């Protein structure tokens, strides 16, 4: 009611008019007036404990591994030149599912570019693994170095 | 607010005394905790107690005599109670203080 333009002056006669008493032209009951309990900018992030996050990730990955949806590859394509056909064929050999999660190192630029354009593929770094991306994927294809990096980070 | 009657937080006297800003406080640990946490005995310093989670990390430590001490244990703390000293020396251990 106080941020809308104008409306600083009491409009008219309180008495004698026979009309309702109004203190501003920007009161909420007026057309063009302010909003009473409206949206304001806010932050929705929550302070979830670390153990809860790590345990949820472990549970998702263990669910994937129970149904042998975990795959390891040396490399997605023959190196130094991205190729979506080769990566698509390799992924087809690995799995016939729809959505896959590809976990490769941050330096594996050729593989990331090779699988970038595939509609069902989501590419993540081993240290960025999270519950949402794992649970969104039918299969999780790991890179050997990425898998070893994840094991080294956790099991150590 | 209490309706104009003199409120409960104003018709009672303030608690007597002062606070002694210079007060020295000790984190306390009983010999029963030592018995339960050091089954083999040995040297028991301040940061062994911190490692075992018997006291906070960066605090003065005083040993008390609540429990039963049946292990030969050498303790180095800031202060001891009388019964604590008798318990530690009774089991053949030593009670040196910083």
């Amino acid at each position: 009611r106080g941020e809308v333009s104008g409306g600083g002056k009491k409009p008219y006669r309180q008495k004698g008019t026979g009309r309702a008493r109004q203190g501003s032209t920007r009161a909420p009951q007026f057309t063009g007036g302010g909003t009473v309990h409206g949206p304001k900018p806010r932050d929705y992030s929550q302070r979830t404990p670390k153990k809860m996050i790590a345990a949820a990730l472990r549970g998702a990955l263990s669910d994937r591994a129970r149904n042998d949806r975990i795959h390891a590859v040396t490399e997605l394509v023959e190196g130094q030149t991205p190729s979506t056909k080769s990566a698509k064929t390799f992924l087809g050999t690995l799995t016939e599912n729809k959505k896959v999660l590809v976990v490769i190192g941050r330096t594996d630029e050729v593989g990331a570019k090779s699988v970038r354009n595939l509609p069902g593929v989501h590419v993540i770094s081993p240290d960025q693994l999270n519950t949402y991306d794992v649970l969104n994927a039918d299969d999780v294809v790991f890179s050997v170095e990425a898998l070893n990096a994840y094991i080294s980070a956790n099991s150590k | 607010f209490e309706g104009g009657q003199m409120p409960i937080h104003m018709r009672l006297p303030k608690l007597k005394g002062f606070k002694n800003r210079f007060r020295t406080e000790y984190q306390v640990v009983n010999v029963g905790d030592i018995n339960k946490a050091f089954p083999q005995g040995g040297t028991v310093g301040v940061d062994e107690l911190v490692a075992k989670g018997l006291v906070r990390k960066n605090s003065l430590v005083k040993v008390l005599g609540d429990g039963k001490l049946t292990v030969k244990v050498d303790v180095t703390a800031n202060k001891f109670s009388g019964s604590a000293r008798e318990a530690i020396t009774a089991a053949g251990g030593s009670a040196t203080e910083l």
């Binding site: - | 409960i8 937080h9 009672l12 006297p13 303030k14 608690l15």
Partner: protein, 63 residues
Amino acid sequence: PKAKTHSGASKRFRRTGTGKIVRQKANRRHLLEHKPTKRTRRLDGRTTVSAADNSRINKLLNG
């Protein structure tokens, strides 16, 4: 904003080991001539806060 506790309540009320709220009794500042020593003895020390005032005093102390 963090809650601000009441100053007077903080000066007038205490908590024991098991969380009991403890206060001091009134009528013991001045005019102690005509008061018999038994009256001033029954007014000495501290008692626990009555059940009616427990909620209000707890509210005044915590915040």
